[PDB]
Design a protein around this ligand. Structure first.
Ligand SMILES: OC[C@H]1O[C@@H](O[C@H]2[C@@H](OC[C@H]3O[C@@H](O[C@H]4[C@H](O)[C@@H](O)[C@H](O)O[C@@H]4CO)[C@H](O)[C@@H](O)[C@@H]3O[C@@H]3O[C@H](CO[C@H]4OC[C@@H](O)[C@H](O)[C@H]4O)[C@@H](O[C@@H]4O[C@H](CO[C@H]5OC[C@@H](O)[C@H](O)[C@H]5O)[C@@H](O)[C@H](O)[C@H]4O)[C@H](O)[C@H]3O)OC[C@@H](O)[C@@H]2O)[C@H](O)[C@@H](O)[C@H]1O
Ligand SMILES: [Cl-]
Ligand SMILES: [Cl-]
Ligand SMILES: [Cl-]
Ligand SMILES: [Cl-]
Ligand SMILES: [Cl-]
Ligand SMILES: [Cl-]
Ligand SMILES: [Cl-]
Ligand SMILES: [Cl-]
Ligand SMILES: [K+]
Ligand SMILES: [K+]
Length: 446
């Protein structure tokens, strides 16, 4: 089923984006079926996008509100291309959900590479913000003190509204965080143009806004499927990225009975590679029976496992590779350890290819705090084993634990009760919104 259970629309040109419908020759079918209401919601999104999108007569009329109000036919939310690729992917998926919940059209700031990495997701009509949008060269300078920043208008009690800037970056404050309150969403609902900048996956705090909560439950009744569905919908790699994927997979990974992904990210100043991290990896994989122990004893048909290791430093894959070369397995399993080329013969090209290759594995080990890992697990429908974040170059004990769900984590959530107007722990409100495994103050859907 190339349409992923109805998540994807038919009718796209096959050759101009091979990944779109070929992803099925490489992936097991997801066990999570998109709800019929999410399927309607996306097919209706496409209708709206086609009516209101870039370059249409409607879009051109709405652009004049920026020089005025207005009272128009089409409203928008523009995603600003900000931060690293994994932050971008998650944040964009979040802004897309927000569009869905508010009957807005999503426009994407293409930044330096978005059109080079991704195909168009909306049948008929591009998702890219036009390059001559007049506010574009203000995007980097938009901040908490910008006149039309929502938080600035809140704290100053500004009275007038064609557009608003929503500062949702990790450094945001109390006023900016009022985005996550119902009364503020009523106000913001009236503004035809929203401009968002964020480096977080802010999905889970949408679930705690009245009104959004009812709609979200209809769309995603199993709760922890938001990124799995919206990520698969939105993001299809371009043919040159997908070539990197298919060629790697077919050469190195395709013969194995089971594929293990290991996504290594080490948040440290010094270059590496670190023994305590090597030790963490071997212990994790071996205590969870993802990879077999080796032994030095002198003294029944063999599975073949392929281990895909992604990392900035090649030492982690080398260490594992060498271990399984130099010693027999205690189980008799055949282990091959593989890592993609570090040196080129599209920096982001290879990075995206690697996230996709991880998503094609059977069991995935991720690194704590890594949005790169979140993207991979989400696209693959993998509930990972998470390598906990080390402190002071000491192997954590336990080394890893299974995640609660495949969802990504919101790293910098608000902690505010909008009704009582005071701080609250927003990870103890509803059972499906919990604190993350890897980052104790973050939130995730479970
Ligand atoms: O949403 C966060 C968002 O951040 C993006 O990255 C941006 C962010 O970087 C922060 C992290 O920097 C790392 O260092 C980088 C460095 O930026 C680069 O220059 C360098 O080349 O690479 C380095 C990595 O190799 C540090 O390793 C991190 O520590 C830092 O994360 C922040 O960590 C502190 C806590 O630090 C302690 O944790 C253990 C240990 O690792 C560290 O040394 C300790 O000191 C957090 O502060 C705590 O925050 C909590 C929660 O409060 C927040 O969230 C809830 C909201 O309501 C609050 O308003 C909000 O403040 C608070 O309760 C505690 O009191 C605080 O101590 C920070 O929250 C962590 O962010 O900023 C710089 C920018 O350059 C980066 O791009 C990242 O890419 C995104 O995925 C996402 O994580
Ligand atoms: Cl419509
Ligand atoms: Cl990244
Ligand atoms: Cl395309
Ligand atoms: Cl400023
Ligand atoms: Cl409110
Ligand atoms: Cl669902
Ligand atoms: Cl790293
Ligand atoms: Cl899994
Ligand atoms: K493209
Ligand atoms: K998979």
């Amino acid at each position: 089923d190339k349409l992923l259970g109805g998540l994807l629309a038919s009718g796209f040109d096959e050759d101009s984006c091979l990944s779109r419908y070929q992803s099925v020759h490489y992936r097991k079918p997801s066990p999570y079926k998109p709800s019929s209401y999410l399927i309607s919601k996306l097919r209706n999104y496409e209708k709206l996008h086609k009516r209101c999108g870039p370059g249409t007569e409607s879009y051109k009329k709405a652009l004049k509100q920026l020089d005025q109000d207005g009272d128009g036919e089409c409203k928008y939310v523009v995603w600003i291309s900000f931060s690293g690729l994994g932050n971008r992917i998650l944040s964009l998926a979040s802004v897309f959900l927000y569009a869905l919940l508010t009957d807005r059209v999503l426009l994407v700031d293409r930044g330096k590479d978005m059109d080079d990495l991704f195909c168009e997701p909306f049948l008929g009509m591009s998702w890219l913000l036009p390059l001559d949008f007049p506010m574009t060269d203000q995007f980097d300078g938009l901040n908490q003190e910008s006149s039309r920043c929502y938080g600035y208008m809140v704290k100053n009690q500004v009275i007038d509204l064609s557009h608003l800037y929503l500062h949702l970056v990790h450094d945001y404050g109390d006023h900016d965080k009022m985005f996550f309150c119902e009364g503020d969403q009523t106000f913001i609902g009236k503004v035809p143009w929203l401009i968002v900048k964020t480096d977080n996956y802010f999905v889970p705090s949408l679930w705690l806004i009245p009104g959004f909560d009812d709609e979200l439950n209809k769309l995603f009744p199993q709760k922890a499927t938001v990124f799995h569905h919206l990520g698969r919908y939105l993001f299809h790699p371009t043919n040159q990225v997908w070539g990197l994927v298919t060629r790697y997979y077919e050469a190195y990974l395709s013969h194995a009975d089971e594929k293990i992904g290991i996504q290594v990210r080490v948040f440290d100043e010094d270059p590496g590679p670190f023994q305590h991290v090597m030790d963490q990896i071997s212990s994790c994989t071996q205590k969870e029976k993802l990879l077999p122990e080796v032994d030095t004893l002198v003294e029944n048909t063999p599975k073949h496992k392929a281990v895909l290791v992604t990392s900035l430093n090649a030492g982690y894959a080398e260490n594992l590779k060498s271990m399984y070369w130099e010693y027999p397995t205690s189980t008799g399993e055949i282990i091959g350890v593989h890592q993609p080329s570090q040196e080129g013969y599209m920096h982001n090209g290879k990075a995206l290819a690697e996230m996709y290759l991880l998503s094609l594995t059977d069991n995935l080990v991720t690194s704590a705090w890594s949005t790169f890992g979140y993207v991979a697990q989400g696209l693959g429908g993998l509930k990972p084993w998470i390598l906990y974040r080390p402190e002071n170059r000491t192997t954590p004990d336990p080394s890893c634990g299974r995640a609660m769900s495949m969802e990504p984590c919101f790293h910098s959530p608000p902690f505010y009760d909008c009704k009582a107007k005071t701080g609250i722990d927003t990870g103890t409100l509803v059972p499906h919104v919990r604190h993350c495994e890897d980052i104790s103050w973050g939130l995730k859907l479970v």
